[PDB]
Amino acid sequence: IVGGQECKDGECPWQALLINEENEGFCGGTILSEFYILTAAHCLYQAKRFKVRVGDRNTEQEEGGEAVHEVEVVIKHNRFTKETYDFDIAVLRLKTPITFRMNVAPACLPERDWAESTLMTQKTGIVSGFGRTHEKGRQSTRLKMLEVPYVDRNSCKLSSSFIITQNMFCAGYDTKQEDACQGDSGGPHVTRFKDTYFVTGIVSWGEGCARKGKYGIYTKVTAFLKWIDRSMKT
Amino acid sequence: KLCSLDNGDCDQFCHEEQNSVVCSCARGYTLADNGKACIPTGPYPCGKQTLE
Numbered sequence: 001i002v003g004g005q006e007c008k009d010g011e012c013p014w015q016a017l018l019i020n021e022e023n024e025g026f027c028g029g030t031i032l033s034e035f036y037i038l039t040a041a042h043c044l045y046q047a048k049r050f051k052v053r054v055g056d057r058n059t060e061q062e063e064g065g066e067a068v069h070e071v072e073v074v075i076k077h078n079r080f081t082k083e084t085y086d087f088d089i090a091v092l093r094l095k096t097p098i099t100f101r102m103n104v105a106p107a108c109l110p111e112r113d114w115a116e117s118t119l120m121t122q123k124t125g126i127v128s129g130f131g132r133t134h135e136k137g138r139q140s141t142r143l144k145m146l147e148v149p150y151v152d153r154n155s156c157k158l159s160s161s162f163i164i165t166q167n168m169f170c171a172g173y174d175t176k177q178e179d180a181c182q183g184d185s186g187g188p189h190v191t192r193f194k195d196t197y198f199v200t201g202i203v204s205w206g207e208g209c210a211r212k213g214k215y216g217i218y219t220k221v222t223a224f225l226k227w228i229d230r231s232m233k234t
Numbered sequence: 235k236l237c238s239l240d241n242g243d244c245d246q247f248c249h250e251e252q253n254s255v256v257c258s259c260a261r262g263y264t265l266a267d268n269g270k271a272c273i274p275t276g277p278y279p280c281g282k283q284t285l286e
């Protein structure tokens with residue numbers, strides 16, 4: 001995360017972290033239930049064999065709330081291509097179930113119609129992650145979060161150099177130097193409604209990070225709710 | 235306005251059935267008797283920040 005704020009104790013319990021063989025985080029994910037992780041499909045190109053760590057907030061300290069989970073089944077969206085970056089979604093079935101605790105809890109999956117008219121019509125959303133704090137910096141050792149305003153579909157399609165499909169939405173700032181960044185991919189974009197947070201997006205891509213007249217491109221979760229339901233019946 | 239008006243007074247999902255407001259919840263929540271509130275049936279319901 002570029003800008004934004006560090007996640008305080010228990011503020012982002014649904015954040016998951018994909019770690020490679022060197023136990024290094026390379027991408028993020030969202031906890032959907034004790035057995036399922038939602039992440040981005042392009043992240044399944046970022047590592048040979050990987051696991052999922054939950055409850056981590058500071059990748060440096062042995063806090064005690066962390067728990068590593070091995071992936072039993074990887075479900076990547078079949079229509080995904082790095083050529084377009086469309087259908088950038090995937091669900092991961094865990095071998096062992098996550099035990100919810102402080103800093104470990106799922107985000108709510110909303111209903112398509114309700115989420116589109118009530119959540120994505122709201123002013124902002126929240127993106128979190130251990131990604132780069134600067135476009136040229138290194139991955140963060142602290143989990144960060146950033147409230148990013150929803151960008152109307154036309155202002156964003158015009159600001160983009162790439163085809164913004166219906167499976168994606170824009171969020172961020174034109175000028176302001178706050179935005180998601182590399183390493184945050186597959187991470188949570190949630191929309192809060194009356195103290196309850198719902199997963200509304202998946203960190204996908206962007207032209208740099210925090211650039212003027214550029215926004216964050218997220219995978220639209222409402223566009224894959226049934227796909228997600230099917231995937232969790234594994 | 236039903237749902238168009240303050241989410242129909244629902245805590246979570248809201249839909250207009252028979253031209254009336256019908257509320258529902260996410261999994262792990264049970265609708266209240268007032269039929270508007272959602273009650274978590276567990277210690278760590280979804281979408282709730284853990285503040286202990």
Ligand SMILES: CN(C)Cc1ccccc1-c1ccc(N2CCc3c(C(F)(F)F)nn(-c4cccc(C(N)=O)c4)c3C2=O)cc1
Nearest residue numbers: 082083084085135162180181182204205206208209216217
């Ligand atoms: C022909 N193919 C290969 C491409 C393609 C095809 C079609 C449509 C679109 C694309 C496309 C895919 C990926 C990117 N890039 C590269 C640069 C980059 C960086 C950094 F740090 F290196 F600058 N961070 N970061 C990043 C990561 C996650 C969230 C955000 C955000 N800002 O919210 C930004 C990106 C990023 O996504 C740009 C365009």
